[PDB]
């Protein structure tokens, strides 16, 4: 039974190492959410600092890939950082060769093709991570593209990842069934973050302090992360209505 | 089963058992700690005196990278030396291209990516060390700890090896009782105490204390070993606290 | 300079090659044979830069002999000539080209026809009734154009070649110390002692 | 058990069995002693014969004018590692006009041994080395294990029954460290140390191998009637 | 053009001029001017309209009007005389063809006809092959058609271009 | 399966220990060193009477001052002999002198452990390397596939080794003549050989300072066999 | 590149891949070599399981290496071509550098060297082939016959056989071949070779191939009728 | 490091089966249904857009891919394996043909190249076969309209009409009854929609179905005028609306 | 490391057989039957397509009979993809020879090269062998009309008549019975079709389940023509010989 150790087909036409890589994805016990506004793309992720000896400022799973592209990872930090460094390298190389900023969906496709190779070549193992790429693309507008260890990728109106993804997914599904539009009809990114946090609170049934959340925002021509104090202002506004 | 015979194989859990076995080698090693102070970092390690024939103060364990980064590790000592050798290449190439000495976070990821790479193929073995390292850069003091998996985070305090649980408890007290922060000289005294307290897990053989520090005020942001009077003052403070 | 002539008569190919080897103002030898037997019915004469000439001929000889052992068959002169041309055509764009000019005389047992091929160091190849390389070619061509007849006998061919060498001795300024003559026919390759 | 097939595999308790098996080859090897004062550093080696017609396998290898080792285990592996030390000593001399520090020679052996313990296809070195030298910080003695672990010591012993010699040196520590500017007395202490590891066989003229390096003494090996003085 | 087509298919985006520009200059620079390609690169993409020039050593420049080749000085003289900001389509074709005419007439290395290509935003690029025909040869004085049998023929033969036949 | 370079729990390389078993199955080779020269003898062991024995080459010249006898998978020895000859000649080219017997042996033994996943397995043959040099006089060495070599006053390898070695233990003294050593090799070969020893199924050779390395004629060996038979019948 | 060590030692000091290669030889059609006073004959078995065969074009069992040396084999046919090609290249390479054709002993030593190399090289299996190499050294009238096997060992033989039922035909040769007086003529030597194969072959029809090599590059392959006359005469003498 | 897997991971079993190729074909069987039908004046290829989540924008995932202006491809099996094959197929059309001959390859030769890439993943060291079957529809001047199937083994066959994946066996029976040699393109699209409806469970509309044709030249899709010989691509992907129009006449 | 997962595709069995070669030959025994018959005045190649469909485009289909040059063709039995890799290699060797010598490659030289490639995959590289058996039909001016076969082992032999793939044992017996040396092409066509018609696992032999080819000196005067039969032409020769 060596067909379960390397990435060769099982008699059922399955790759078990790929399936087990998907399981590693939830080892961190962290849930991420991504939505689209009119002018922006917001990504929120749970932040857990279990050790008092840890420097909480260094504990992050959101990455600034390029000036325009942000990436949140669901999986262990070594593989997350492996994927982060590679995406940063690929984004920089693209701009040098082709003379324009790598689109979010194209970086997604590239990282998905690299993932596909680890499923076909034996000596390389799959990375135990799901990558969620966000940007305001200059052609496609607000963009969410997500990669997995199978080498699969697709676009999203909104998306959720982690142990409790199905609860968040259905909560978002129900909202978009009412509004009958593919985005959050809101002018400011501040209110789109407030929507993202509110709908995560409703879906997980948990309250959040400023230190419990981690927020990434993509606007036209920059992706940035919020500070604890920026999140606190967001939490105050939610409580006051 | 058989999922634990080959490195880079995912178990049905989604675990790399070879990496988890490497952690056992680390847990077997001597105690090593790191303390982040007001304007720098302190490193300390337990050296077991196997025999009287060991020359005192000669078998140095703490290793410098560039001139501003200290590295200490617990587990297979050779595996640590191999990792520091790579760190010294990475720090050399960075300085060669970008001029500025490698920032601590930047250096952390260089070790991180290299250790993680030794979990991608079954042609290599994972590193049998956990590495506590850090120093002073342009953005201030940074303390990091790096595991065989390639996992690392920033720390207020760090501990690894056989006496890690004892050490961690003593570090957690300092964080609570000093929210405003700890001075470099205080952190040397405290480092001595914590190694002496963590020696209860290795109480069979007597040991030799070895401390190093990088402080903006005390060492001008360079990595130096604590020697002579300041080392004896820390040993005296430690000996007074256990009695 | 070195004289290599070829004449193709009705039933054979005759090759005349100068016996003198000289480097500058020195005569290194007066009995040199500038010929290699490629196969039982194929003969190659070569002139050119010192070392390159013999090295190239022996290299070609080894390859043709290898083919003969492997297939227990004799390559046709047309095939041998094409192989030789291609080796030279490779060498011109090489780091150090072979500076060798060759004449290939062969009897094709399948067609029962003699064939003469002229190839220069660039890999330029033509099939000719008569051919030559170097300064000697200028003279001998004009003479052979007048006298040569395609249904000539081997004896008639030798007499015409004898005339060419005699005229070359008078007209040429360098001493080529006579020629060695070899005939290629159905019976094989033989050396004409009397010349 | 299932985890000893190659050097790239950790056991469930975090042990490397191929390395531990290599460590075993040393224990099978013949005994060799190392000890030093402040002025001189001495190697003493018991050489092993195949039979009475055979010669006694050489144990001590010169690496430079100021450095050399004694071996216990696979002799061919000692030849590979000693050749590497010879080269590194040689590189230091030619490029920097600098005699290689004994401590830095240790660091280089360690790192060479380590690479063979973390890569597939290769195997660990099956030999243990005692490196003596005199450099700019005085006399030095090192112990090398093919795990990669290198240790600086006042004295030590490796090979079969080495524990006897190691205990003697642990008692004599305060005496033999003070033997400064007396090479003969330091060798006597080394010959008396290795004697604690003998059983049945005793030290004969073609059995005993001694080497010394010091303040005004190049690394020299003594064999044959040159060691009859110390028997 | 090949690599741009593969890039377009990979990204699912219409190709950009800055891409073709970047790929051309990095290729030419590699070969240190030994590939003697001097190009004027124009096009419309989702970013807008672009006009670049690329020299054989791997250098590029941006302009509203550019000219290249042996006739560039004749062409640039017309452009520097008649160019203004906010040109219409009709005006820009007139200016471009006039600048080529200057090259045809005054440059020995240039001649014959004027080829134009218009690339308007949100439209199909129209390629106007032989937009002008200013140099049409006049009728010859004599027909040099020979009487049949004028040429001496040694031999005649049918050439077999067909494959090996059946039966 | 398992690594080719794998250690056993006893700290021995599996593939080396296994090759030593291949050598035990090999035909017998004996060497005796004296102050008058070094003698080398081998059992030829032809598999059939139609096999022309004189074609069996198990004693081989390396240089004029170094002979070599082999035992085990003898085909494996060809590349070792090739390397030895190349080393001996190369050293003479670089230093204008004869290479030391120990240095030549050390060179051959450096190939031994060059195997892994270099060649796929160790050598399955042992060598007796006999020679003379000005520094250490007449010398006999035993080269193993482990990479280890020992000097010997006398040594036997192959199927009859431990029986032969016990005989050499009693017979060898420091005052042996070359004639005495020749008869002694013939005596011990005749003892351990399956078939009856004659000039066609056994082969003698020696290395002297004066004449160098010589493989004996069948006619010469035949006379020494007849001399042996008579002196054994004399008491 | 594929480095895997396929030929390794076993606890009893055997190399199984080399020993399994000898089993491939055992399966091969029988080949016999007999040297007379002034000739060497190579006899080869053709298994009659294959009829409707085109004997004009089918690879023959005896291969010329040079004009004066021949090689026959038992074992994998495909493997034999690779050894024959290397030998033919080395024969021309020797002529080119030494300005003399190979001795039979030299050509044997080369082929045996190749076979050995494929027993301790990574990523390769040994040759499933044993060879009989026969001929006359340049300007020599002394017959030469050598044998090689997958291990790489080689040796000279008065007469020898390899392949299936070689144990039987070796038994025949050991009692019928006198060293003091070998087959004086070509007739006697061919007769003894045909006789030796008739112990194993089955029918004396198209199942026996005979190749006679004489000094000075004189090599000829006997026809069906010529061999059939030997088969007829042998059995007519046997009826007594 | 280094790729130390220099050996085949697909070998013959005692029964003469190549396990990894059989297991690859099993992966294809689990895949969503795709089909192709050849008319007199065109070819149609079709498949179901099986959306993993309703939050997912299924338009961004293209199952039907342009390989050249006159050649399209659809698959059944592992999507990632298809995506990298489309990338390699597009590139080899250029490197091995268009950069040599200055024209796009004919259908049968591009198929031959894709087939070669898949055969190599069946014999080359340290790789598994591709877990997809491709249907490739194309037009070229001398061969006309053609439809090919390519399997994990690297084997390919030309088809008048066929189906691969989940409900292929039923689909192939349906096509055998409807197909004649006198079908117009609109007839083949109608039959394609009828056949595909049988294998689809949920919603059946332009948003859940992906359909493309190889038909007449589309000068409106060329992107430039002026060159008479360039008349535009024969590959066209049908819009959501264009599919829904033909579902009313169904 | 990686050793764990290596099948070792190039080792001998204790009986001195090559595992992967033997297993590849087992594969080929399930492939459609291909027959080659050599006559005085030409060669016939007949082969059976494996269980086809009514929706397979036959007139543009090729799985069995492939052209190597104008003088040499091959019938395939095994993995079609594996065959196409080797066929393209052979096509290149033939054009390499023609470029070097300015003569069409003799049939045996092309056969020997393709066979030597197969051999290599059995002795080194650690890759699986090619699961293919070829029948080579060819003409040259040394040996005239020639039939050869090669198998995954890299062994090749010459034949007057031969079969590869399914039911070879049966096919070879029928050929050995009815074949004579003075036989002509028209007769050899009839023999080939009659042999397939009896060995086939199908209910009946029809045009849509056959590939057919002849190499004739039936080309106007002193030259050789290759004829790959069209579907309608296979239908006609089936009626002529009286099988349908
Ligand atoms: Cl890619
Ligand atoms: Mg893998």
Swiss-Prot record, chain C:
Anything else known: Present with 21800 molecules/cell in log phase SD medium.
Gene: PRE1
Key words, A-Z: Acetylation, Cytoplasm, Nucleus, Phosphoprotein, Proteasome
Positions bearing Phosphoserine: 76
Role description: Non-catalytic component of the proteasome which degrades poly-ubiquitinated proteins in the cytoplasm and in the nucleus. It is essential for the regulated turnover of proteins and for the removal of misfolded proteins. The proteasome is a multicatalytic proteinase complex that is characterized by its ability to cleave peptides with Arg, Phe, Tyr, Leu, and Glu adjacent to the leaving group at neutral or slightly basic pH. It has an ATP-dependent proteolytic activity. This subunit has a chymotrypsin-like activity.
Protein name: Proteasome subunit beta type-4
Any GO molecular function: endopeptidase activator activity
Gene3D superfamilies per record: Glutamine Phosphoribosylpyrophosphate, subunit 1, domain 1
Compartments in which it is found: Cytoplasm; Nucleus
Database matches in InterPro entries: Ntn_hydrolases_N, Proteasome_beta2, Proteasome_bsu_CS, Proteasome_sua/b, Proteasome_suB-type
Protein family: Belongs to the peptidase T1B family.
Originating species: Saccharomyces cerevisiae (strain ATCC 204508 / S288c)
GO biological process entries: proteasomal ubiquitin-independent protein catabolic process; proteasome-mediated ubiquitin-dependent protein catabolic process
Modified residues (N-acetylmethionine): 1
GO CC annotation terms, alphabetical: cytosol; endoplasmic reticulum membrane; nucleus; proteasome complex; proteasome core complex, beta-subunit complex
Annotated signal sequence range: none
Curated annotation (Swiss-Prot), chain E:
GO cellular component, one term: proteasome complex
Keyword presence, Metal-binding: no
Catalytic activity line of the entry: Cleavage of peptide bonds with very broad specificity
Any single biological process term in GO: proteasomal ubiquitin-independent protein catabolic process
Keywords per UniProt: Cytoplasm, Hydrolase, Nucleus, Protease, Proteasome, Threonine protease, Zymogen
Subcellular location as annotated: Cytoplasm; Nucleus
GO function terms (MF aspect): endopeptidase activity; threonine-type endopeptidase activity
More about this protein: Present with 11400 molecules/cell in log phase SD medium.
Family: Belongs to the peptidase T1B family.
Protein name as annotated: Proteasome subunit beta type-2
Name of encoding gene: PUP1
From Swiss-Prot, chain G:
Cell division listed as a keyword: no
Protein family according to the UniProt entry: Belongs to the peptidase T1A family.
Modified residues (Phosphothreonine): 58
Cellular component terms (Gene Ontology): mitochondrion; nuclear outer membrane-endoplasmic reticulum membrane network; nucleus; proteasome complex; proteasome core complex, alpha-subunit complex; proteasome storage granule
Protein name per its UniProtKB record: Proteasome subunit alpha type-4
SMART domains per UniProt: Proteasome_A_N
Provenance organism: Saccharomyces cerevisiae (strain ATCC 204508 / S288c) (Baker's yeast)
Cross-referenced CDD domains: proteasome_alpha_type_7
Functional summary from the UniProt entry: The proteasome degrades poly-ubiquitinated proteins in the cytoplasm and in the nucleus. It is essential for the regulated turnover of proteins and for the removal of misfolded proteins. The proteasome is a multicatalytic proteinase complex that is characterized by its ability to cleave peptides with Arg, Phe, Tyr, Leu, and Glu adjacent to the leaving group at neutral or slightly basic pH. It has an ATP-dependent proteolytic activity.
Miscellaneous remark of the record: Present with 16800 molecules/cell in log phase SD medium.
Pfam families, A to Z: Proteasome, Proteasome_A_N
Location within or outside the cell: Cytoplasm; Nucleus
Parts of the chain that traverse the membrane: none
Any GO BP annotation: proteasome-mediated ubiquitin-dependent protein catabolic process
Sorted UniProt keywords: Cytoplasm, Nucleus, Phosphoprotein, Proteasome
From Swiss-Prot, chain H:
Pfam families: Proteasome, Proteasome_A_N
Matching SUPFAM superfamilies: N-terminal nucleophile aminohydrolases (Ntn hydrolases)
Cross-link (Glycyl lysine isopeptide (Lys-Gly) (interchain with G-Cter in ubiquitin)): 108
GO process annotations (BP): proteasomal ubiquitin-independent protein catabolic process; proteasome-mediated ubiquitin-dependent protein catabolic process
Keyword annotations: Cytoplasm, Isopeptide bond, Nucleus, Proteasome, Ubl conjugation
Transmembrane portions of the chain: none
Location, primary (coarse class): cytoplasm
Cellular location(s): Cytoplasm; Nucleus
One term under GO cellular component: proteasome complex
Function description: The proteasome degrades poly-ubiquitinated proteins in the cytoplasm and in the nucleus. It is essential for the regulated turnover of proteins and for the removal of misfolded proteins. The proteasome is a multicatalytic proteinase complex that is characterized by its ability to cleave peptides with Arg, Phe, Tyr, Leu, and Glu adjacent to the leaving group at neutral or slightly basic pH. It has an ATP-dependent proteolytic activity.
Other comment: Present with 7060 molecules/cell in log phase SD medium.
Family: Belongs to the peptidase T1A family.
Official protein name in the record: Proteasome subunit alpha type-2
Organism: Saccharomyces cerevisiae (strain ATCC 204508 / S288c)
